[PDB]
Structure formats: structure tokens, C-alpha cells
Amino acid sequence: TNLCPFHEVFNATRFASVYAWNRTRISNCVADYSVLYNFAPFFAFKCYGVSPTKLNDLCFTNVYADSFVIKGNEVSQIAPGQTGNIADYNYKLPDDFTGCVIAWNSNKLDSKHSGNYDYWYRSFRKSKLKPFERDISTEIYQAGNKPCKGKGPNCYFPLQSYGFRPTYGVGHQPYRVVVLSFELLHAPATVCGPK
Amino acid sequence: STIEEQAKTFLDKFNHEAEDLFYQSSLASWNYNTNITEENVQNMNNAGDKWSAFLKEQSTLAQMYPLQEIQNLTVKLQLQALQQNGSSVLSEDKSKRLNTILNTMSTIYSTGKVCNPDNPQECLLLEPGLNEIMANSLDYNERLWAWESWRSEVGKQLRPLYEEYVVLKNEMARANHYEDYGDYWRGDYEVNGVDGYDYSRGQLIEDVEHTFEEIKPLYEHLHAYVRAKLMNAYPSYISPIGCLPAHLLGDMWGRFWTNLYSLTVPFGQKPNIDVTDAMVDQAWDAQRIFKEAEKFFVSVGLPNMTQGFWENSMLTDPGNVQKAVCHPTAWDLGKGDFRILMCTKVTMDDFLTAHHEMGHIQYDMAYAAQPFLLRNGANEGFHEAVGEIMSLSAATPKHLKSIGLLSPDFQEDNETEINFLLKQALTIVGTLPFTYMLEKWRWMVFKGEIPKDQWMKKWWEMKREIVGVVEPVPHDETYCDPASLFHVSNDYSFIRYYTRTLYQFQFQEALCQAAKHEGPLHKCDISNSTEAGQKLFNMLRLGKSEPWTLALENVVGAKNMNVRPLLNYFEPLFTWLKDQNKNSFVGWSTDWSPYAD
């Protein structure tokens, strides 16, 4: 019996940012969804399209996992058909999404005194993103009508920091979100549930 | 691209850093106010300097966006708030001189001591000082000395400093496209842009005078009633048709007449309502008081407090190893952080002040979703009014009987109601004429109608004309008695108290009518009512994005301030005072003076 390595995704020491997220591929193993209550029993699951009861007796080909860190007031934007600054410029989900969204509070891990400026997010962009798209450009945004040369009036930097602190409110605390996508292709399904 | 998108981007970029910097400054200020050390002072000064430098560098950059090309009201208000130059229009030498004068006046007021004439080594302070003398004393000469020494020692070293301060402030106001400092102060009550809700800086004085013309008779009757008992208090001193001495009003300046309740009690044989003994017998504490306040605030349909509030607030005195300031203040730091600093004792006054502080906290939590530049009240006298409308409801006999502090065998009679109404009146009505006269005198001084050689003359004339108080000793133009007050020497305003006094009664009447109350107004209680809670939350969530006229119409259905609620509240006391003064003289003459004999 070969189990899928969920400890490499749920028990990581350092996570990534929302503008540059990681995507792992899981295949040829058994998906045991009972070890998730050891990282944190309080796992806020949110399934769109499939039920957790009928998810145990299904077989898929590839399972993708995405991880990032956002605030507490931005968890609602991780859903099909949402509008904001994270869903439009950082990470967008399609209207026909079939998966689950898991999040938990990590205040006692990603928070220090004098500010934690190791997390960034994009706020300024020209257009919107497409479903499952990634952008890591660091060019100066032009808001006026003059050519941008350096940095100054009407020329801003597209990245901004969070700076978490343990004294912040429950809405301004860091949260770790994990997205699980299920894909079925014309290939033998090597990812089934326990029997 | 147009100007609106650039302005929006600039505002977002500004707020993103302004929130963090303001949070750091507030945290430093809290750490200073909790523990008094030198490192805390250094950190607070550094944070304040950084915040001031940020506010300076963020200015002069929003000048690229003219207000004549913006059609959105919110962005226009934010830009207008950001484009204020301030004191930077003056030269550096004048600014340094003004800061030096301000610090000198603050140090002179904060450092004062009155020494004994017969013993120069016996020098007393002010607060553990002349306050206790003016509070509890029944001697004419002692009060006269404590008044004259205080008004002659620290009343002569602030004349030229105040003159130069007035000159510099007038120059700054004229440089900032204002007529004088009075217009700069009245600019808060200004609404321009919305049809049907505009307000000018000249209608406020007219409204204040129109309200005072109707408030005057009640004050006349109250003064006539107080003078009759003052005649019996000090024989052969008070005149039956004369004014009242300034050193007998209860305190140093005569702002409140609360200390005169012991001598002007209507019925001394009836007991009073003091739940202090019951609280001591039931062994309560600060936790119980704050939990009762939270239960009261939740009973109307308001959210609960946060865990950080109970984990980070200081509700008890630390002791002697750690020094702190026991002034009750509400702290809003941002990012969902609300704290209360208060040295709570087992009394009734602290039980009433807890509700005021919790109302302040609720108001602060109401507009947490508004932008940073709009996270403030719609007007000056709104927070205090919200606190007072809760304190009045918490100070009702029905609430005390329901929470278990009063025995259910209490017999409510008419004399107890009369005593309660008189005790409330001696505190509420006694401060309106003083504030009105002081503000009018300051406005006339800033405008330039009173020459320098007539300041004290016009001051005492307006005193004897409006308030009806005559000085025991005449003073020349060498004294600066009007500057002996804290708010006068620290550059603060006074009309907020009048506005709050009106708005609290307006809101009280509105909420009691919405709660379907029957009977007198002073017995109203808004406990266990969701309609009033929703009607109040609809206004508390607006913040500063809407004019105060619309916010007042959404509550009481009116656009301006009114005085009828106060008259409806004090009607029974008015009738009783009429019945008592039917056999007495009403009015006062300005010809009599204590130094005439």
C-alpha cells in the first residue's frame, strides 16, 4: 500500500506568496484523507461540484494542489464567480470548477514582532487574468500619459507587502489555503481511494 | 486615462502605508501610556516624527489633481482632506516661535503651585490642591483667597504670549484663505455640493443664538431658585436682587454646579440612589461591570467584543511598581485592535463611565469598513452623544431593579423624581451659558472687534449680562483670567459640548419614540429592543462619507438642531420651579457689586 505524500504539502516550513504559487502533481498512490486532522483538525473544506461521501470510491488520473497565503477577509474571494483584487489579479477559478478548498489559521506560525514582510501580492495591473494563470512580472505600472522611466509620480511598484503581527484582529491574520483539482483524461486512472 | 483613475491609485497607495504607520504610532503611544519610562518616550517621539514626515511628504503630491475635474464625492472629499497645507505656509522662524510659545504655555499651565502667605515653604499644587479647597469649604475668606491667588499668580504671565499667539494664528488663517481663526474652527460645520443639505459658516451663530433665546427662561428660573438658598447659606453676603460671586459657584471657574447639590437639596429626608453599598456587599469587580455592560449592549442587537479586547485591555490599577495615567480613554489602533484603559473602582460613577467607553468602542467598530480618511464621526458632538444616550439609559431605576442592584421594595415618589431632575439640571443646564459666552468672546477677539485695552472689560460685561456673575475684586488690563482654563491654553474648541447636549436629547427622544415607550421621558429605557438598535446602526455605519444633516434626518427626521426635547424633558422641574418661585423675585441687576459697600 503506497500512500500519497500529503506531508510535503500540508507540513511545509515555508509557504509561497499569492502572486507566485506552487503547483504539485500527485499520481500513482492511495489518497488517504484521514491524516489531514493531524496537521490541524479544523480544516475548513469547501467542495464545489463533488461530494466528500462520493469522493472516496472514485478514480482519477492526476490531482493538482495549489498553496498560498492570504488574509482572513480574502478567503471569500477564492470561489467561482468572485470579484476583487485577489480573484482578478492573483488567482482566479473557472465557473465549472470541480474540487475542494481547504483553509486554516496559521497565526502562531507566520507572524512576528516588528512586522513580517516576506509575503507580497499584486494590486496594479492593466488587464485581468484567465483561469489557472500565473504572472511574476515586476515592471513599473504606468498610470499617466507619459513614458515611464524609473519611479516617481504616476509610476508605482506592482507589489505590496502584508506585514503580519500577532496583535492584529481575526480578519487581518494569515491563512493557508490549499486547492485540490481533479482531472480525468483518456488514460488509466492510477489515483483511487482506500478500500 | 483621466484624472479619476490616477486619484484612485494614489489614494490606494497612500492608505496602504498610512494604515501601517498609524498602527505603529498608536502602538508606541499605548506602550508609553501603560509604562512610563525614558525608552518609551524615545520610541513615541521617533514614531511621531516618522508619521509627521510621512504626512509631510504625502502632501504637495496631491496638488496635481484639481478638484474641479472630479465628479465622485468620496474621492473629492479625500483629496480635499489631503490638500490642506496647515502651518507649513508660514516661514520657519515663525513656526518655531509658535511651537515655542505653545510649549511654554503648556509647561506654565502644567507646572503651577500656590504658596502660603504666612509660610512661603508651604506651597500647594493645583489638582491635589485648590480643587479640594474649592470643592469642600464653607468660608468666604478662604475661597476668596484661593480664587484671587490663582487668578493673579498664573493670570499675569500669559498676556503677551497669548497676544503673539493670536497674531500668529490670524496670520496663518489669512494665509490659508480664511478670514480668521474662527472661520477655520467653524469650517467643520460646512457642507457644499449636495442640493438640499448645504450649510454655511454663518448660520451656526444664528442657530446658537436662536436656541439660547429659548433656553434663557429656564436658566433664569434655576438661578432665581439657587440664589434664594444661597442667601440662607451665606448671610449678609448675597443680594436678593443682585448677581452671584464667582468664588461660590462650586469650582474654580464655575463650569459645573454639581457641588451645590448638598446645599440646594429639595427634600433632605428622602434617601438617594447609591448602589455602591450593594456592589460592595455582593463583592463585584471590573470583570462583572464590563460583562454587564456587554450584556446591555448585546440586548439591543449589537455584536460582541473581540478576544483581543479582553486579552490586551487594562481594566485595573497595576499598583506602585508600574506608573500609568488613570484618565479613561478609548483606543482605536486599527487592524481590528480595540483597547480600553481605565483604573476601575467599585463605585457607581465607574459603572456609568464603562457604558460611555463601551459606546465609544461600538462607534469606533461601526465604521471599520470605511476608507482610512473617512474613519471618523460625522461631526464633533457625536461620540459623546452616543455615550450619553447609553449612560442615561443605564442610570435608570428600572434597569438597576432588573439587574439586581436595587431591592424590589423601592417606592418611587414625586420627590425622588424632583431630586433626580434637579441633580441632572445642575450639571446639564449650568454649562451652556458659560460655554456660549466663552466661545462668543473668543470669536469676537479673533475677529478683531474688541481692542486690546478692553479685553477684561468686555469679558466681565458679557459675564454680568449673560451668566449673571459679578467679580468680587475689579481687575485691570494686566490680568489674563480667561486664559486660566485648560482648553483655552491648549488650543481647543467648545461648541462641541453644546452640539452634544442638543444631539443627545434629540437621539434619546427619537429612540424612545421608536421603542414604543409610554409615560414621562426621563423613565425611558431602550433595553431589549432591536428596532432602535437597527435604526442607530444605520447611522453609525455611515461614518464621514455622508453629511451630518442627512445622518440626522435618518434618525430624527430633521436637518438642523432643536431644543424642544430638552424642554419636554425638564417640563416637570420647570413647573415645580414656577410653583416655588411664585413668591420670589426673578431676574438680576448688573448695578450691584460686592465692592460697592
Side-chain angles (χ1 to χ4, degrees):
Chain A
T1 300
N2 197 333
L3 287 78
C4 306
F6 287 158
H7 63 271
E8 300 291 338
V9 185
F10 288 85
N11 199 263
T13 304
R14 176 66 63 88
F15 274 71
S17 302
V18 63
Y19 76 99
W21 39 268
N22 289 270
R23 192 174 189 178
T24 59
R25 177 177 172 270
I26 300 180
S27 180
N28 297 90
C29 55
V30 178
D32 178 70
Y33 293 148
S34 300
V35 80
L36 279 69
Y37 303 93
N38 114 90
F39 307 110
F42 12 85
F43 264 10
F45 86 105
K46 259 112 47 223
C47 304
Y48 301 92
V50 75
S51 179
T53 59
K54 300 182 283 79
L55 198 60
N56 191 25
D57 60 327
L58 291 180
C59 294
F60 299 94
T61 300
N62 296 328
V63 179
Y64 293 96
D66 308 73
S67 61
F68 51 88
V69 178
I70 55 180
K71 300 190 305 178
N73 299 120
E74 301 174 353
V75 187
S76 302
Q77 297 185 8
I78 306 299
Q82 297 295 336
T83 307
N85 57 277
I86 300 298
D88 296 359
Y89 298 147
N90 296 269
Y91 185 81
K92 193 176 187 303
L93 291 176
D95 300 330
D96 51 74
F97 179 74
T98 56
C100 306
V101 178
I102 305 179
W104 65 87
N105 181 270
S106 60
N107 183 28
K108 63 270 302 301
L109 299 179
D110 303 72
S111 294
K112 302 177 303 180
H113 286 356
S114 179
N116 179 87
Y117 304 96
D118 297 329
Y119 293 90
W120 301 79
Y121 70 99
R122 184 179 304 272
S123 59
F124 299 146
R125 207 203 177 199
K126 300 182 61 180
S127 59
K128 295 182 179 179
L129 282 175
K130 297 180 299 180
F132 297 148
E133 192 178 3
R134 179 179 175 180
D135 189 8
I136 55 179
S137 180
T138 57
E139 298 181 0
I140 309 299
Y141 181 79
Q142 177 183 355
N145 297 328
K146 297 181 180 299
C148 176
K149 182 181 300 180
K151 180 186 301 180
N154 298 329
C155 302
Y156 311 96
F157 202 83
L159 298 179
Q160 297 178 177
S161 180
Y162 274 145
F164 297 106
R165 287 182 174 89
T167 58
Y168 288 169
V170 74
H172 300 264
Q173 285 179 357
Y175 281 81
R176 295 180 171 181
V177 184
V178 178
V179 184
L180 299 178
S181 300
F182 304 96
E183 183 179 2
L184 178 59
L185 203 60
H186 296 352
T190 61
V191 182
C192 300
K195 300 180 180 300
Chain B
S1 181
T2 61
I3 313 296
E4 296 186 0
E5 292 79 5
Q6 308 175 1
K8 293 180 181 62
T9 304
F10 178 80
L11 290 175
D12 298 330
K13 215 281 181 301
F14 169 78
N15 297 332
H16 178 63
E17 303 178 1
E19 292 187 3
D20 184 67
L21 267 65
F22 185 80
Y23 183 87
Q24 294 184 5
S25 299
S26 300
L27 183 59
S29 182
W30 173 271
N31 288 329
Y32 162 72
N33 290 272
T34 50
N35 187 17
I36 303 180
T37 53
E38 188 70 20
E39 182 180 359
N40 296 328
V41 175
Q42 248 68 19
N43 295 16
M44 180 182 61
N45 285 263
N46 295 332
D49 295 331
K50 291 185 60 180
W51 175 251
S52 182
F54 181 80
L55 287 184
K56 284 291 300 178
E57 66 176 358
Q58 285 295 334
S59 182
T60 331
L61 295 182
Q63 310 290 345
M64 303 175 57
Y65 315 97
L67 296 178
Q68 58 181 2
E69 301 180 359
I70 302 299
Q71 298 183 2
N72 186 271
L73 295 181
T74 303
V75 184
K76 184 178 181 179
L77 290 178
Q78 295 189 31
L79 291 181
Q80 184 177 356
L82 287 180
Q83 287 182 359
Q84 296 181 0
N85 294 330
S87 61
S88 59
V89 65
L90 299 179
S91 60
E92 184 177 358
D93 301 330
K94 293 185 177 182
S95 180
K96 182 180 180 180
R97 178 60 179 179
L98 183 61
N99 292 21
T100 302
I101 291 179
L102 291 180
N103 291 274
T104 301
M105 292 189 302
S106 182
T107 305
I108 288 180
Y109 179 81
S110 60
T111 304
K113 51 194 293 88
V114 178
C115 302
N116 181 269
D118 301 330
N119 185 20
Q121 287 73 11
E122 182 181 1
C123 305
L124 300 179
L125 297 180
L126 178 61
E127 191 275 343
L130 304 180
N131 287 339
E132 300 292 338
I133 300 180
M134 288 295 184
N136 303 329
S137 59
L138 290 83
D139 186 73
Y140 190 92
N141 300 330
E142 181 179 0
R143 298 174 67 94
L144 178 59
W145 170 79
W147 177 83
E148 180 66 25
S149 179
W150 175 255
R151 258 173 176 81
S152 181
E153 181 179 4
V154 211
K156 300 177 59 60
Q157 304 176 357
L158 300 177
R159 182 62 176 270
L161 288 79
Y162 197 84
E163 293 180 359
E164 189 172 358
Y165 161 83
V166 169
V167 172
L168 292 180
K169 286 304 182 179
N170 290 20
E171 292 182 1
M172 176 267 184
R174 288 187 294 266
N176 288 266
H177 299 278
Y178 286 102
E179 301 179 1
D180 50 73
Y181 212 1
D183 293 70
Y184 187 88
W185 277 349
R186 293 190 297 265
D188 183 71
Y189 307 91
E190 183 176 359
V191 177
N192 293 322
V194 182
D195 300 330
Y197 298 96
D198 295 325
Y199 206 91
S200 60
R201 299 191 297 264
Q203 193 177 357
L204 180 61
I205 307 179
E206 304 177 0
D207 298 359
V208 169
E209 293 182 358
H210 183 59
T211 53
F212 186 81
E213 286 293 337
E214 301 183 7
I215 295 181
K216 191 175 184 180
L218 182 58
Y219 179 80
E220 292 182 358
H221 281 277
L222 182 60
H223 176 263
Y225 176 80
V226 170
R227 182 176 57 183
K229 306 199 67 178
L230 285 180
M231 290 180 60
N232 300 331
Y234 301 95
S236 180
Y237 287 156
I238 308 300
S239 179
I241 56 180
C243 300
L244 300 180
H247 60 277
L248 301 178
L249 299 182
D251 63 81
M252 179 63 61
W253 309 275
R255 182 181 176 185
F256 297 101
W257 294 358
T258 308
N259 300 329
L260 298 181
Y261 177 79
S262 60
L263 301 180
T264 60
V265 47
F267 302 96
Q269 66 281 357
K270 292 294 184 179
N272 203 330
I273 301 180
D274 182 70
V275 299
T276 304
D277 298 330
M279 295 177 60
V280 174
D281 206 334
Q282 294 185 1
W284 283 20
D285 52 354
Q287 294 284 346
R288 187 70 176 274
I289 298 178
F290 278 89
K291 286 186 177 303
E292 290 291 339
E294 181 183 4
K295 290 176 74 278
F296 170 78
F297 272 84
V298 172
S299 61
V300 303
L302 297 181
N304 308 337
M305 290 300 180
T306 59
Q307 185 179 0
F309 174 80
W310 295 105
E311 290 180 351
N312 302 326
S313 299
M314 177 182 300
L315 307 182
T316 53
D317 195 309
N320 300 270
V321 297
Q322 183 177 355
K323 303 299 297 300
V325 182
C326 282
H327 188 58
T329 51
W331 291 81
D332 186 10
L333 293 82
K335 301 296 181 60
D337 193 4
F338 307 96
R339 304 177 183 180
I340 291 183
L341 204 164
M342 182 180 180
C343 303
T344 302
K345 301 178 61 60
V346 185
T347 46
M348 188 179 181
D349 305 330
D350 298 1
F351 178 79
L352 299 179
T353 313
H355 293 69
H356 186 86
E357 302 291 72
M358 187 160 297
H360 280 8
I361 294 299
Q362 291 286 349
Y363 204 172
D364 293 331
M365 295 174 57
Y367 50 77
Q370 297 291 340
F372 180 82
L373 296 177
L374 303 182
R375 288 172 185 176
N376 200 331
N379 199 19
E380 298 179 355
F382 266 58
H383 297 260
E384 298 183 359
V386 172
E388 291 291 339
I389 61 178
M390 300 300 180
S391 299
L392 290 178
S393 299
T396 58
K398 179 191 301 180
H399 187 73
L400 299 178
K401 181 181 177 180
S402 62
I403 62 181
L405 290 185
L406 289 181
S407 180
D409 302 330
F410 185 81
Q411 302 294 338
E412 301 179 1
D413 54 74
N414 305 17
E415 305 182 12
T416 304
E417 302 178 10
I418 294 299
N419 294 15
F420 180 78
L421 288 181
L422 180 59
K423 187 177 181 180
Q424 292 288 345
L426 290 180
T427 306
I428 295 179
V429 195
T431 183
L432 300 180
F434 180 82
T435 296
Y436 171 78
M437 199 282 305
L438 182 136
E439 192 67 23
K440 186 177 182 180
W441 185 88
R442 297 182 76 180
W443 284 348
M444 292 182 61
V445 167
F446 284 156
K447 188 176 181 180
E449 298 181 358
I450 299 180
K452 298 181 180 180
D453 62 331
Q454 296 178 0
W455 280 6
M456 304 301 300
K457 178 181 180 180
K458 291 298 181 180
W459 173 265
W460 291 115
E461 285 181 359
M462 294 179 61
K463 275 286 192 178
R464 289 192 296 266
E465 184 178 358
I466 299 180
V467 188
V469 175
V470 58
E471 69 285 350
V473 176
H475 296 171
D476 53 354
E477 301 302 87
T478 62
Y479 296 93
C480 200
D481 299 0
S484 60
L485 193 59
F486 171 79
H487 299 72
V488 183
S489 60
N490 288 83
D491 193 6
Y492 286 97
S493 181
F494 250 94
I495 197 61
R496 55 175 62 180
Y497 304 99
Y498 195 90
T499 60
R500 175 257 301 180
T501 304
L502 297 186
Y503 295 157
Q504 62 184 25
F505 285 101
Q506 292 187 181
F507 293 152
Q508 182 70 14
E509 176 171 337
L511 293 181
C512 296
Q513 290 186 4
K516 300 180 180 180
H517 178 66
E518 300 180 0
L521 185 60
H522 62 269
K523 299 179 180 179
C524 163
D525 191 7
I526 60 178
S527 300
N528 298 272
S529 181
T530 58
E531 298 82 7
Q534 181 69 19
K535 195 176 186 61
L536 187 60
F537 184 84
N538 290 332
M539 191 272 298
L540 296 183
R541 63 176 299 180
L542 298 182
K544 209 179 181 181
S545 61
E546 297 288 343
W548 59 276
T549 57
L550 183 60
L552 186 61
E553 184 181 3
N554 292 334
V555 179
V556 309
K559 301 179 181 180
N560 290 19
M561 54 188 60
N562 200 330
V563 83
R564 293 301 304 177
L566 193 149
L567 306 182
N568 297 330
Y569 190 90
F570 289 95
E571 180 69 21
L573 181 59
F574 200 7
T575 304
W576 189 84
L577 287 179
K578 285 185 176 180
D579 182 70
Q580 292 292 337
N581 296 330
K582 279 180 180 180
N583 300 331
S584 300
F585 176 77
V586 183
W588 64 93
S589 180
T590 60
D591 301 330
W592 183 88
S593 60
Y595 55 90
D597 300 330

